[PDB]
Amino acid sequence: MNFGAFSINPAMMAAAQAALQSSWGMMGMLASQQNQ
Amino acid sequence: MNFGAFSINPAMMAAAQAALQSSWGMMGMLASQQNQ
Amino acid sequence: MNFGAFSINPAMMAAAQAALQSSWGMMGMLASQQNQ
Amino acid sequence: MNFGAFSINPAMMAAAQAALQSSWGMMGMLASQQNQ
Amino acid sequence: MNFGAFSINPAMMAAAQAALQSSWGMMGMLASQQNQ
Amino acid sequence: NFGAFSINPAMMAAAQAALQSSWGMMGMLASQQNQSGPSGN
Amino acid sequence: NFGAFSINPAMMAAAQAALQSSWGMMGMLASQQNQSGPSGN
Amino acid sequence: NFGAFSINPAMMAAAQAALQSSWGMMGMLASQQNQSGPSGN
Amino acid sequence: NFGAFSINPAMMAAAQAALQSSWGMMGMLASQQNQSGPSGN
Amino acid sequence: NFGAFSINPAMMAAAQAALQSSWGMMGMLASQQNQSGPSGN
């Protein structure tokens, strides 16, 4: 009856002369409850 | 009956001569409740 | 019957000669309740 | 019957010779209640 | 029957020789209640 | 350097009726925000 | 350098009726955000 | 350098009726975000 | 350099009825994000 | 350099009825993200 945790946690890091770029296409949940 | 936590937590970091750029396309939840 | 927490928490950081730019396309929730 | 928290909390930081610019396309909730 | 909190809290910071500029495209809620 | 769009909503009520229809956050936008990185200490 | 779109929603109620229909976050957008990296210490 | 799309939702209620229909996060977008890497210490 | 699409949802209620129908995160997008690597220390 | 698609959902309720139907994360996307490697120390 209870779902729980829905976590999307995107995080980026880089260091020490590194290079870092990105682009997200699509991201998301899609969730549902039934009871009868 | 209770959903829970819906968390999107995007975070960016970089250091020490790094480079960092980004662009998000689409992001979001899509959620629903039924009871009968 | 109770949803819970709907959290979008985007945050940006960078340090120490870093570079940081971004642009978001689309962001948002899309949520719903039914009971019958 | 009760939704909960609808939080968008965008925040920006950078330090120590960093550079930081951004532009948001679209942002927002889209939410709904039904009971019958 | 009760919604809850609808929070958009955009905040900007930067320090220590940093640079910081931005421009928002669109921002806002879009929310609704039904009961029958 | 954009295009075009057209919006004609038809909303009518009737006997013992009500419709609410809050809507609309729409258009097009363009962004010029390039930059160049800083230099050494 | 975009295209085109068309939106005609038909919403009608009737006897003992109500419709709410909150909608709309729509269009097109374009991004120029290139950069060049920093240099040494 | 995009295309085209068309959206005509038909929503009608009736006796002792309600429909809610929250919807819409839609369009097209384009991205220019190239860069060049930094140099030595 | 895209194509095309068409969306016509038909949603109708009736006696003692309700439909909710939250939907829509849709379109097309394109990405230019190439780069060149950094150099030595 | 894409194609095409068409989406017509038919959703109707009836007496003592409800349908919810949350849906939609759809389209096409293209990626330009090549790079060149760094050099020596």
Looking at chain G, which subunits does it touch, using at least 3 CB pairs closer than 8 Å as the criterion?
A: B, C, D, E, F, H, I
Specify the experimental method: cryo-EM
Classify residue C6 by burial, with Cβ atoms within 10 Å: 0-12, 13-18, 19+. Answer: buried
Helix, strand, or coil (residue J33):
coil
Interacting residues of H7 by C-beta distance below 8 A, sequence separation 6+: G5, G6, G7, G8, G9, H26, I6, I7, I8
Half-sphere exposure of C9 (CA within 13 A, CB side): 12
Closest CA to H6 of F11, G21, I8: I8
Residues of C in contact with H38 (CB under 8 A): 17, 19
Are I20 and D36 a contacting pair at CB < 8 A? no
Closest CA to C31 of G21, G26, H22: H22
* CA-based radius of gyration for chain F: 23
Dihedral-angle region of residue D25 (phi above 0 means left; psi in -120 to 50 means alpha; beta otherwise): alpha
Distance of CA B29 to the CA centre of its chain: 8
Classify residue J36 by burial, with Cβ atoms within 10 Å: 0-12, 13-18, 19+. Answer: exposed
The answer to whether I19 and C36 have CB atoms below 8 angstroms apart is no
Interacting residues of A11 by C-beta distance below 8 A, sequence separation 6+: B9, B10, B11, B12, B13
CA–CA dist A29, A31 (Å, integer): 6
CA–CA dist C21, I19 (Å, integer): 42
The answer to whether D6 and D31 have CB atoms below 8 angstroms apart is yes
Distance of CA A35 to the CA centre of its chain: 27
In angstroms, what is the resolution? 3.8
- To the nearest 5 percent, what fractions of chain I are helix, strand and coil? 0, 50, 50
- For chain C, give the longest Cα–Cα distance: 58
Number of H-type helices and E-type strands within chain H: 0, 5
The answer to whether F8 and G6 have CB atoms below 8 angstroms apart is no
Of G5, G12, G30, the CB nearest to F31: G30
Query: What is the 3-class SS of E1-36, one letter each residue?
Result: CCCEEEEECCEECCCCCCEEEEEECCCCCCECCCCC
Are B32 and A29 a contacting pair at CB < 8 A? no
Chain I interface mutation, best of B30, B33, B34, B36, highest count of I Cβ atoms under 10 Å: B30
* G26-32 sheet: strands from edge to edge: F26-32, G26-32, H26-32, I26-32, J26-32
Distance from CA of B16 to the nearest CA of C (A): 5
CA–CA dist J31, I38 (Å, integer): 22
Within 10 A of J35 (CB to CB), how many other CB atoms are there?
15
Backbone angles phi, psi at A29, to 5 degrees: -85, 170
Helix, strand, or coil (residue B27):
coil
Closest CA to I7 of H33, D10, D23, J5: J5
Are H39 and I41 a contacting pair at CB < 8 A? no
Closest CA to G33 of D21, A22, D15: D21
For residue J30, the cross-strand partners are: I30
Dihedral-angle region of residue H25 (phi above 0 means left; psi in -120 to 50 means alpha; beta otherwise): beta
Residue with tokens 């120490």: C16
Are H22 and D36 a contacting pair at CB < 8 A? no
Closest CA to A27 of A6, A3, A4, A13: A6
CA–CA dist F6, F27 (Å, integer): 11
Of A17, A21, A23, the CB nearest to H38: A17
DSSP code of residue H23? B
